[PDB]
Amino acid sequence: DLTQHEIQALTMKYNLADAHTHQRQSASQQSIVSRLPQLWYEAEEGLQATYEKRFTEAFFQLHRQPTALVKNKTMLSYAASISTMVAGMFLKKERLAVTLIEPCFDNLYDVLANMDVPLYPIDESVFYDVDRIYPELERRVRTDALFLVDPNNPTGFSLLRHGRKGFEEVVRFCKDHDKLLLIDFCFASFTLFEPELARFDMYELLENSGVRYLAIEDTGKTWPVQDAKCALITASDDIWETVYNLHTSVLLNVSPFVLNMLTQYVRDSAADRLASVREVLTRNRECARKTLDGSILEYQEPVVKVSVAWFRVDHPELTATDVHRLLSADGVYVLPGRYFYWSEPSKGDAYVRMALAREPEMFADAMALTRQVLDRH
């Protein structure tokens, strides 16, 4: 019940629970907000397909996925969880069991379980050594589908630490062994413009390999758009028609006004190479790291500079549940890790997640209070 813990924090003093964006608008993003009336009238007079096309083009240009634009088969929905429910309907129709990454944000588990998809965990550590990925998958993936989250939420882990080879090994395994490969790329924006970690064209690999796949992309966790957002799903050619028919039963269209607005955010971030996103996260990440260094919350350095920070509880008795209780009694709301080890929540009582997509002044105040609370125990 992550969302329910995030519902409570949304009312609270220092909400560091949900990863939704709550930083304010940059100077140039304020120029988008100021033009919302113009963007409204544009969408009212133009064609729906125009705003879909321009959003999809801007998005995959920023993310440097040109193969996705050549194939031109991506479908848009209100949110990544909606795209996930479309994938869930496909998994249920094919009666497939899923091997799902663990840890991962629990709402992925919850939505798939709620559509009665069988779920079996595979630990993130199977991906740490590039030359062991394939034999580890051969041992441990004993279902017809494999569902990854890359970069991962909450750890920031990514196969991109291995260049192309990590993903190539996963795709090799799934092709060789007739596995459907599902990948949630919602955190992939945080790799962009990184000298070593910037995502390559994933769709070139997925298409060239001929693997059966479903790939989900997102805007909501990248930009401060107050959850007025859009997610994207792309399927391999062999299942595209089935998935298309499932998708059209859910919605006809995303708001062309929202799409028009989102396109401006994407273009704005192309212009500043995502600086207004990255700099806010870096300031809060550094503040958390320096504030909590040496405390019972042991910072877990992520592969990718994602919008959440992950900590191990380094104490002989206290759990993450204890830590969450103590911090919330003083008005600071974090998430216990239980909410991420969906197959075995007690494993998550060793970890805590904090959201970084926050105004830095509020975040710094929350960090000062957090260390003061922790220092009493």
Added chain:
Amino acid sequence: LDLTQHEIQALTMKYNLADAHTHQRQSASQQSIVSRLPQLWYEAEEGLQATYEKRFTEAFFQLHRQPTALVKNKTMLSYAASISTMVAGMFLKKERLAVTLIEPCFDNLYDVLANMDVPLYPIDESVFYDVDRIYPELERRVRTDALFLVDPNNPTGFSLLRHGRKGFEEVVRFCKDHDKLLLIDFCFASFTLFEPELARFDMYELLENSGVRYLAIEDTGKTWPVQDAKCALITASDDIWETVYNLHTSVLLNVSPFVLNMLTQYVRDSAADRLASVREVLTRNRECARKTLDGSILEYQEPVVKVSVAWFRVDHPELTATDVHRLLSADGVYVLPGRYFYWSEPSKGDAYVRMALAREPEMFADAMALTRQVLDRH
């Protein structure tokens, strides 16, 4: 293929009379809301999410005159009525419930539940025409443990409100007596508001008092010209509320507080003008369609409720709705053939055509003139 895919193609066309989504422009007071979008954005950044949920829900159920829903204060918000329907689908599957679903109805209601592997069986709308036959007809025909109605119905505009309170009271009596889950899609209910005889009564008072197990879905997207930046509402009976709450929270944490803030302005604006700016556009186009097609091969089917779609019967010896759709689209006018509204037996829909009325009157009048010109050739 489904009606939504027909609507994707029509959305690329000038005379799109297919999707029921709102495509009329803004009223003068609605252009004021548009001018405040920057302030509505910054307000939602500074305020609490729960504040915008509460203010929206209050405005919505004040306009719809559903005070019981505000007392219970257990309604959950989602991106769209189909998303609320998928939450209902998750509950139906968890409880092994099959659904007796109204026919005709817009096909994605059938399709999305079928795509969730919910077993579905039709019940014809005519079961509800005679108030004193509703209960015995349901006893003889409903052989599932859930019953899913759409009221007012899409595409016919039919409503149990023709019977005052008694039609809904008989449906609820049946479902309570026989331990059935009652699901009701109220997305068209705004079109009853301020009607002297048809204005919806407080449905949640009846649902709560009866003790019936229920899921009730409400919508904004079909009412206001908000370019599908919208919100739907679902309310569950107390005995299933906790299960449904947990299902709902797996789908989304929150609707955009910016969108909620904006929608609240539209709801308040329509309270101030008694939905005049919505009703007048539909009236202008409904009357244009009726006058243009009177005596034509498209026979207007008068609805109980003045909903945002018009329903026509094909009155011709040989031509079907499929033929009419092809003939009109060949000349640039896109309507929906009735086939898919009869989701259990599409051949029954080959005698019907649906036209969307939530359109700019000038475009709609030009579409009607072109439609008449095509039909005048057969």
